[PDB]
Write an enzyme that holds these catalytic residues in place. Structure first.
Site, PDB file in Angstrom:
ATOM      1  N   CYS A   1      -7.918  -2.627   7.544  1.00 50.60           N
ATOM      2  CA  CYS A   1      -6.514  -2.649   7.106  1.00 50.60           C
ATOM      3  C   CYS A   1      -5.989  -1.243   6.856  1.00 50.60           C
ATOM      4  O   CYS A   1      -4.930  -0.853   7.370  1.00 50.60           O
ATOM      5  CB  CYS A   1      -6.367  -3.480   5.830  1.00 50.60           C
ATOM      6  SG  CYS A   1      -6.550  -5.283   6.065  1.00 50.60           S
TER       7      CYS A   1
ATOM      8  N   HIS B   1      -0.701  -6.228   1.652  1.00 51.83           N
ATOM      9  CA  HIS B   1      -1.919  -7.003   1.456  1.00 51.83           C
ATOM     10  C   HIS B   1      -1.552  -8.314   0.776  1.00 51.83           C
ATOM     11  O   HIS B   1      -0.729  -8.341  -0.137  1.00 51.83           O
ATOM     12  CB  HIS B   1      -2.937  -6.232   0.603  1.00 51.83           C
ATOM     13  CG  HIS B   1      -3.969  -5.465   1.377  1.00 51.83           C
ATOM     14  ND1 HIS B   1      -4.070  -4.092   1.294  1.00 51.83           N
ATOM     15  CD2 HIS B   1      -4.969  -5.867   2.205  1.00 51.83           C
ATOM     16  CE1 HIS B   1      -5.076  -3.678   2.043  1.00 51.83           C
ATOM     17  NE2 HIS B   1      -5.638  -4.733   2.609  1.00 51.83           N
TER      18      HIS B   1
ATOM     19  N   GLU C   1       0.828  -1.197   0.000  1.00 50.41           N
ATOM     20  CA  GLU C   1       0.000   0.000   0.000  1.00 50.41           C
ATOM     21  C   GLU C   1       0.861   1.245   0.000  1.00 50.41           C
ATOM     22  O   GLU C   1       1.779   1.387   0.823  1.00 50.41           O
ATOM     23  CB  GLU C   1      -0.935   0.016   1.209  1.00 50.41           C
ATOM     24  CG  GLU C   1      -1.905  -1.156   1.210  1.00 50.41           C
ATOM     25  CD  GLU C   1      -2.736  -1.265  -0.050  1.00 50.41           C
ATOM     26  OE1 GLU C   1      -2.923  -0.243  -0.757  1.00 50.41           O
ATOM     27  OE2 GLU C   1      -3.186  -2.395  -0.344  1.00 50.41           O
TER      28      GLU C   1
END
Lengths: 210, 210, 210, 210
Positions: free
Chosen positions: D144, D169, D81
């Site tokens: 998350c 992830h 991310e």
């Protein structure tokens, strides 16, 4: 003496590797329960040479079961083809640079052949081994579908329609996914060890049923 | 006097609407250039009643061409089915709540029938009309595929194999897409006006070829 | 005197057309309720020229609301961008052939700006008009995200943070879908009339709220 | 003495398993080359308890780097991310049955924080290990993303902005894919061994860079 014929395909298109070739190579000679042995061969991604080579294998190896495998780059899970369609229609060239458009594989032969593998037994064996998978109802119209139709037809025409025969499409492995251009969507993939194990589990279920 | 039989399906599953029904309803009675007229009917999403209703239509209307249509929620563009497979395998219940698993449609009938519509002529007419579309090589094994197989088989068994007959799957319309639950992926869709126009263009190409 | 600034982008990459340009062109001068008028402009797909042109538009047009639009080829439905991120990272070249990698848009500026459009009001207006749509939480890091960040930052730095400003990504139209190569997956698309109507409905909801 | 904090999440939604939990559990206590050790913890899928537990971990372990991991069911490859957004917007309930709609995580805090992991070094280490992967530019707005924003904010507010911190992830593992209902599309997945190895390679690249 009972032989399971296992085939894979060479690399094609922009793919550097073919996980079906790697799986067939690793599993050649595998002893399965009930006296069965795996005999592996690699087919070219070109329908005329592949059919010729598969006819020789079917004739010379006289297998009790036939498991044809190939890459389906983009699919997330191993699948079993339900039906081989008697048409060649290529969205990309084969390895000879050839394309076919709406081309019947055989004049005056069936429009399709249903695969004769024990589909549900394989699915259940896969699930037992914690492998996700399903039945596919189109193999495409490229060389993978061609050899599925070709084998089912040859078997039927030689009075061996009872020989379980079908197609197992496998996802990309890591090598195939890694070679995708950066501007294209990423591919679902499986480690080759996962792909090879799925082909092995399928082979074991086929011969256990037969 | 030449009749194009155009069918759609009633709503099913969680879909409030069926764009194939809306298209068939709007196009019923359309006059086409070769003296051809569209005759429309709506089929239930249930194989036994759908087959019974379609046999009656084929028998009573004696059409010069058959265009079967249905919803393929998830596909982005109109498609033509190349092949109807003689198997029922339902991932969801039909409108009677029934499922079938690996069920042959007919004992002692072909594993499949190829559609006899002028597929490439339709694609070309679509492109001329600025409509994206393609040939599909699996119609699924739900009720849409069933009626494709059923119509092609009935025509062949009644000496009418020359009657062009096939299946046109359409995307979700707005109503189908709007009813998708908020937790599920969004559907590709087309305004009903676009869907209906694609069905019309296809019908016009079918009768132009005869 | 209240002006809604509406922008679209020129064609880029392999796309022959840009539905955001067509929408902005059709809606220019639209009279909206409450004395509001749409003023449209077309931005180049190149961040330096686009930012310069957008700064001039923001300064010279002094809009009461800013609706930036662009193509998101592959998305099935119109979406509203929730956030513009202060990074340029190009998966494909811009129209000057340039790429950026992990490039901050501004030294010592916020990592992101949240869009200030009435997002839920637009969604509800869309649903009322039977248009499927949703909020997107990444605009990518190409030129569309760039102008979203650029506008929100300029507005904030000129004491106009209260001016509702955001980004509306639109699907491919028919022209964009038709130009996709035959070997690539087909694109979700919408007729341009559907895209233009969605941008219009969004514009009407924005000014009704403001 | 240098500690890499590695977190995963408990199972949530219809998922029987969470591959991020399995990876963190297997890697706890791993010795890395620079005198670094992995310290693992499992977070609940609930923002308030997860934030409370993560603050305690950041405070008590005082890690030299932070690797947060979570499941992204549907993604085909591991991703990093780029950005945590200061908004909670839940498409599904958390494990307390709660939903949030357009909720700011913190009043008077940045709209977003960019991850401070060495993103390109990790991608390169993944590729060297034959692992496909990429940078993601939205983590979603579920739990998350929340912990990514929370960790980056806490570190910044405690003068520890230099501590590399981000989110990894992971795809579904086999167990997650096998639990998908038969009517839903199949998930891309990876064997847990592949997932855990990707997390390990990333941790090793993080500490090698420091």
């Amino acid at each position: 003496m009972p032989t399971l014929l296992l085939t894979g395909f060479e690399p094609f298109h922009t793919h550097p590797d073919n996980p079906s070739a790697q799986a067939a190579q690793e599993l050649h000679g595998l002893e399965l329960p009930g006296g069965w042995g795996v005999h592996s061969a690699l087919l070219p991604v070109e329908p005329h040479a592949a059919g010729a080579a598969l006819t020789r294998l079917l004739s010379e190896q006289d297998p009790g079961a036939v498991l044809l495998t190939g890459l389906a780059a983009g699919r997330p899970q191993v699948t079993l083809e339900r039906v081989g369609v008697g048409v060649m229609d290529f969205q990309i060239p084969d390895n000879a640079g050839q394309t076919y458009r709406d081309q019947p594989i055989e004049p005056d032969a069936p429009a399709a052949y249903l695969a004769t593998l024990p589909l549900r037994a394989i699915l259940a064996a896969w699930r037992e081994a914690e492998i996700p998978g399903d039945i596919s109802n189109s193999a495409g119209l490229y060389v993978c579908n061609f050899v599925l139709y070709h084998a089912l037809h040859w078997l039927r025409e030689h009075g061996r329609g009872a020989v379980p025969c079908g197609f197992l499409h496998v996802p990309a492995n890591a090598a195939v996914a890694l070679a995708v251009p950066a501007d294209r969507p990423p591919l679902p993939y499986l480690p080759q060890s996962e792909i090879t194990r799925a082909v092995r589990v399928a082979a074991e279920a086929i011969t256990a049923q037969s």
